[PDB]
Amino acid sequence: MRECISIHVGQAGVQIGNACWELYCLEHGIQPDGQMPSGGGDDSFNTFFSETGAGKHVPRAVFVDLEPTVIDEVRTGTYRQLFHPEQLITGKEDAANNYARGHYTIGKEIIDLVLDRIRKLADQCTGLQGFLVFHSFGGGTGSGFTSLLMERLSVDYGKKSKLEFSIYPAPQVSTAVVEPYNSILTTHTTLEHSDCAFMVDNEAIYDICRRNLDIERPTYTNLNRLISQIVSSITASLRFDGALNVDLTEFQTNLVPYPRIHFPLATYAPVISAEKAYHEQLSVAEITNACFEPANQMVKCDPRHGKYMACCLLYRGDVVPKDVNAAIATIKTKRSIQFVDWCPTGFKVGINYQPPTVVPGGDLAKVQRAVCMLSNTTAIAEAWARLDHKFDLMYAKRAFVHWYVGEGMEEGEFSEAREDMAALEKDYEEVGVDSVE
Amino acid sequence: MRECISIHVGQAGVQIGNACWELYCLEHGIQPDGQMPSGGGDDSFNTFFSETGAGKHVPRAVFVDLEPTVIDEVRTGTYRQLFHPEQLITGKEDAANNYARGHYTIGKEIIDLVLDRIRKLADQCTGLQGFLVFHSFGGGTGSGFTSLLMERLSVDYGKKSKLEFSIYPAPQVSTAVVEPYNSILTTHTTLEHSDCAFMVDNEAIYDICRRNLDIERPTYTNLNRLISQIVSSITASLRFDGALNVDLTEFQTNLVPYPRIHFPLATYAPVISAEKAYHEQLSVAEITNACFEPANQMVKCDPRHGKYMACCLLYRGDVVPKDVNAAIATIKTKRSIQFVDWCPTGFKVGINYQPPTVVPGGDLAKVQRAVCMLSNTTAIAEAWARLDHKFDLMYAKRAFVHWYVGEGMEEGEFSEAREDMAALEKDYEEVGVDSVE
Amino acid sequence: MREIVHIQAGQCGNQIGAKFWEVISDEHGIDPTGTYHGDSDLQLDRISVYYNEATGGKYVPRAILVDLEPGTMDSVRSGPFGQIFRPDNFVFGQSGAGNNWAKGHYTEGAELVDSVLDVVRKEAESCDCLQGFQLTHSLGGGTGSGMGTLLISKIREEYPDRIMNTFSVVPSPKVSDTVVEPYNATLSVHQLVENTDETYCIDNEALYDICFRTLKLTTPTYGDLNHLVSATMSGVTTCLRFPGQLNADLRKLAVNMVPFPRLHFFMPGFAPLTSRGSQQYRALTVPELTQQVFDAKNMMAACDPRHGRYLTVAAVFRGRMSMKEVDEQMLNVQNKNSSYFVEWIPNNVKTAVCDIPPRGLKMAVTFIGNSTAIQELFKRISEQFTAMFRRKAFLHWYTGEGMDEMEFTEAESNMNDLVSEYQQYQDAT
Amino acid sequence: MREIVHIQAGQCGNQIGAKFWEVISDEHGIDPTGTYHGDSDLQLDRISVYYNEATGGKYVPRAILVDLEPGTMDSVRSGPFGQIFRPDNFVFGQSGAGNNWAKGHYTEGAELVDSVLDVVRKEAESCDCLQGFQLTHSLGGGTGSGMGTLLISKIREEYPDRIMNTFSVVPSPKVSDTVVEPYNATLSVHQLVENTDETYCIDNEALYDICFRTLKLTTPTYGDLNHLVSATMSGVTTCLRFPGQLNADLRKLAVNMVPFPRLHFFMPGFAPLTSRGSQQYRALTVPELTQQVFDAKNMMAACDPRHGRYLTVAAVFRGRMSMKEVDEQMLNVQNKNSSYFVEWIPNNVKTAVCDIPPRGLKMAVTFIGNSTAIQELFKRISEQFTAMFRRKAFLHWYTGEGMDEMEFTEAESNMNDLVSEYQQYQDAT
């Protein structure tokens, strides 16, 4: 009862999944071999872990990659005994940062087996609540295979919600030449089939890690730990009791005002170093004030350019409803946060009793209070415009089109995807432009 | 494997062959008895020697002379045990400096026996790849009989290549009266049949021995020793390991631009006495510069008056590619040494690790580096013009024609030979003209 | 899994392949006997990429050695690792082919190509999941250029979908050791442009210049040059063998680097490179590595990148580093050297990171560059070819083997089209 | 191989042959008994050239002795090397023909020439590979001239393809001993020029002058003159008998010396010729020998070469001399004497070298000169012939024994033709 199925695709998705399942094992006290020696803990494991007669707890997770390297790393790693062997799926060769290769030619062999594994897990579940998908748009395997799997799962389980946590290409930083083609190709599929997708930018988390943790040169481990913290904060409402709980469906109903507009931005607070944590008291009001600043947003754009349409605050730790009511009143008073006129009440609050869990040897300081905000705004249209410019500038000369055409993709798909992204940007700018009574 | 058959005709040919086989025996450590008490020696003898069951090593050679005295000197000399009795072929009367006598009347008896012995040697050979022929143009035997043998071998073994090392009449020094007639009659077959002919002059080697080695009166033994060193330098690439190996076909492909232009000059360095060797450095750049001096050309022609068309540098001993590349760059930027415009790269480099061997009782100093430089150039047209002038002066009066027509030829042969040499010198001066566009 | 079949042609290719297998055996911890004596399980985890396993733990390379003259085969068999190779994979003739492209391609090579393809087919059907081929050859020679082009064409016929990579030593106007190099290179380029996915041009001049100015070697020999080329060859194939934070498959590299199908002629490079004295004083970090690779004088071909523009760049880093440093440094390089990158690609740079550095070094990097400056080598080669071919300098040797002048003109036209396309995309805006 | 048959005619020819065989027998280390007692194998290697091998090591000269009277042959039998000859080869008449050419040729000659040809044939079939013949005779006498000419004609009929060498003692106007010397020489010259391949003219005046001025002999007898001739006889045939660095047999010499077939009359010479007293005060070297041979006072034919020109020259050196020295001296001589050497032959000199010096002579050289100055002797003989033939009173002796005056006129015309040819080639330009 009250469980969700998690899917990890590509290298980014798999590594983030290792970070997330390490965090969940730490939160529920499950030692990595699966045993559980140790009253929310007596039921919270049922959300993410399934139990067997021997007392072992197995993740409800599936790991897929068309190349074997990362899956072999986790097979040899610390958590090798945690995951059931059938969950870990391997292809034979990566998509080579090619959407067509990931989707059409190579993904067809593995998609049937992946769907069979998901079907087995869903049959095991009763009272299933959702679908968490972790991938990256820039990759070939991530983009193509996630597009294929989301369309298949939308056909199979269309009456159930699906959540996405995707890594977005930065405006300047990049690690692949053909990122725009893969990203614009997969925006249509995620827009059509995803119920709520959360956007991530590596450069934003680099800046956040610099500013708030003093790390001069962080790595993917820290960013994946932060992603794990955000998703754990989202799922804590189901996993644990609270004074004001929010379910995934009611959360989506609050946050999503229109069908296509389902791309909120995520932020977390208080992110602080262990050196600076002692100095500041970290009250609810200052946590709420810090959570709204531009510099803490994890997609590199200023919300001051855009307009906020709906906000969802998820507090965990010692919190009282007065404090958050006063904090939201104070935030509504400030004019830098411009909410849309047509939405009178733009905030939904949830409170949870359990404090955030701190990983051993992590950079983030222990704190008795924490908040995670999911906010729908028009600022992401700027990042979409930047990516569209980066796409069309090279598409005008047909920069790398023959590689995609060789794998069965048609040239018209690029134009159709560009038209779809143009329509989405026009919708996003249209809804927030103005209103008259 | 990779064998070569040596042929020695006439007094000059056999007397050079004595020094050549002495040098080969010393280099491979084979006694004149034929035993080898002494891993490059395990197969390097296979090029020139054939191993019998009892460990004796037999030369792959054929010695021919219509006059029996020099062959009897070989039979009575030190190397009587080394050579096979049948390969030492002998007639009864000398050719008497008569081309017609050597070619038509006396040669017909013994040419069949010579061809049978060469057939037997070729049958014993498994990877044979060339013929080595040593003779003198001035002599009646060395002209007529070698013309007959050259055309017969061209008929029999037309695919296989042929290399001649010929002694040419000097501009002024001469030991017989009918040298122009014999040489002019030889050149037609030399041009048509042989694949590469190496011209040598007695007067040039005398001047070289006077200047470099400081021997006041040079004798045939030192001339033959120098020619032996030349051929050993040519064959060392086949016989020994090296960083850059050049076989006979590779050499001909590099050095022969056109089919009728196959008359290189040959030089050796460091040709130096034992007294001067202690003072001089004799490094790579020094020997490379010494190779291009007009003094060391071995044929009395000025390289300045001609133009170089293709050069082959066969280094032996302790040499590195860097040094020879720098030396070639220096020689190319020098302007006294002028190359044709249509040959942007006129240098073919070969290196091997076997330093030169010094014969006992010799004159050449022991040196750890040596270079053999062969070069196709247009300077030999001057020597051909000198010999044609001598031929015209003698033939205008029909000086000695009665002896030649007595032995079965016509004046049409003389006229045709003169016309052929006229055409050859016309072609040699033709290729030296700069391109029109 | 994801195997590579390695092929060697000619003296230069055989020597570079010997140095390559020496380096790979040192990396994986394999003796010349072939027994494994490493120190980590990662070496055995993907030893199958380059080696096949025998009964008693002996690992045999998946190498094919070809040369028409058996002296090079004797040298390799007598070498330090000569015992490691399979005796059946030594295919050779009886005559060194001269320096004649016609003789290497048509007459002599036709006999040996059947046996070579038989051994290649045996090795390839022995593979669990073949990824591609590798071939070492020198373009100036006859055997190397001609028979390598023939073998590449026939392998492309047999296995059209697989990757085929080449590492080609191009002729140079200052280390020319053979008269007829322009004919062989011109005839080889027409086959190379069509029948290969990736080709890596190498210059002996650039290698000697690196050895002199950077390493300060007094008397460099071919061993050091082959060691540098082997370092690059080991660097490009790290992601298949060892784990990393970002993995670059050969297909991934090809997709990133090749915008248009005929522009696959790359310029390699490697860093760090230093003298023994300078190694002490040197600071060894990602900014130093990035600056060293993007320096022109570290490039493996005698060309200035300053003349042309970089279409694409790839950097395969090895060792442990924070890839934020990689990203910010490489962005800084792109910004401060913008004029040398084409406008019609926003980010010209691909990055990969492998955890294991090479042989005691703290870190390393292999640089691949697809640039418009590569046309200069073909320009000078075409100039030499035209100067020789105006007078029909050495054509009788080739026509004796069976070639025709029509093929020479076609090869010249094809190289002209190649440099025309490169100049077109240089001038594009 | 390459054997020579030696024939002697007349008193002068018999004495010269006796000294010739004495010199050669001493050279090959053969006693008068014929037993070999040499010291080197080179003497015995080609002893077959002149000597036949009998049983028990006895060596018989291959010599024919002819004379129309027996006294000279009895003297030769009683000589120091008289026993060595074969008794069967002594063919004699009964009257010495006076000095009559007709008596020597027709009447007395016809009887004895058959037996002479029989013994010559007997030796000739015994020879394995016959090279040629040698003849010693005096043109001034009747017996020598008639028998030599008849025998030469018949041997040329028998063996047309074999070389014939004659060593003819020509008359001179100063040492004339008989009155009919012009008639005998005039009758002999026609057969000599027609039926011989080499003819070496000797003159008694020249040998007497050499003996007086050069050797300082107070009372030179015929033995010294014959020894001087025998020195050249041994010199010309040295290359056949002994090894050397440049071999020149009789056919090689003939091909080098005869441009046109009738110009085979040569001038011999020899060096070093010095007196026993002066020989201490002179260095024996190749320049000294080369200057001495070309000295006109060293010529053995009583001609002045400055009055004519050299067509060709031959030098047969003996000893261990180096040959660029020979070439330098020969080229220097040709440069200085370029007025004397004909312009239409570029190189007039034929060099030969042998390794074995003659008896007691560290070095030796034999000079052979074809020069236009030889016509002076024929001019003198023709002048004396015309002076005596203008009166028919002396011709009755020759008219007896069957001759006629048409023979005399024809012989005079032939000598005129010979000197005309020599003068024509002197005047050629």
Ligand SMILES: Nc1nc2c(ncn2[C@@H]2O[C@H](COP(=O)(O)CP(=O)(O)OP(=O)(O)O)[C@@H](O)[C@H]2O)c(=O)[nH]1
């Ligand atoms: N970097 C290296 N270049 C080399 C080496 N050996 C030769 N070469 C160069 O290769 C070029 C000639 O190529 P090869 O000699 O291998 C010719 P190949 O054997 O392929 O054909 P044939 O001439 O028909 O034997 C020339 O520029 C040489 O300097 C080496 O070990 N390293």
Ligand SMILES: Nc1nc2c(ncn2[C@@H]2O[C@H](COP(=O)(O)CP(=O)(O)OP(=O)(O)O)[C@@H](O)[C@H]2O)c(=O)[nH]1
């Ligand atoms: N150089 C020499 N000349 C000689 C010798 N004996 C004679 N002569 C000269 O040779 C010339 C010919 O004299 P011969 O008696 O030999 C004439 P031959 O016997 O051939 O004819 P007949 O007079 O009919 O007997 C004459 O001038 C002699 O003086 C000699 O031993 N040596």
Ligand SMILES: Nc1nc2c(ncn2[C@@H]2O[C@H](COP(=O)(O)OP(=O)(O)OP(=O)(O)O)[C@@H](O)[C@H]2O)c(=O)[nH]1
């Ligand atoms: N935040 C984060 N991003 C990652 C991580 N690993 C890879 N990425 C991102 O993934 C992008 C490259 O696409 P990938 O997802 O690695 O490609 P893939 O899914 O393996 O598919 P292929 O291209 O076929 O290999 C890079 O631009 C990175 O930003 C990670 O561990 N953490």
Ligand SMILES: Nc1nc2c(ncn2[C@@H]2O[C@H](COP(=O)(O)OP(=O)(O)OP(=O)(O)O)[C@@H](O)[C@H]2O)c(=O)[nH]1
């Ligand atoms: N360099 C050198 N030249 C020699 C040697 N022997 C003879 N010659 C030259 O050979 C030329 C004459 O040709 P030969 O070879 O002697 O004549 P042949 O081949 O024996 O034939 P014939 O003329 O019948 O004797 C002379 O001009 C010499 O210069 C020698 O040992 N060394």
Ligand SMILES: [Mg+2]
């Ligand atoms: Mg991947």
Ligand SMILES: [Mg+2]
């Ligand atoms: Mg000879």
Ligand SMILES: [Mg+2]
């Ligand atoms: Mg080779």
Ligand SMILES: [Mg+2]
């Ligand atoms: Mg008498």
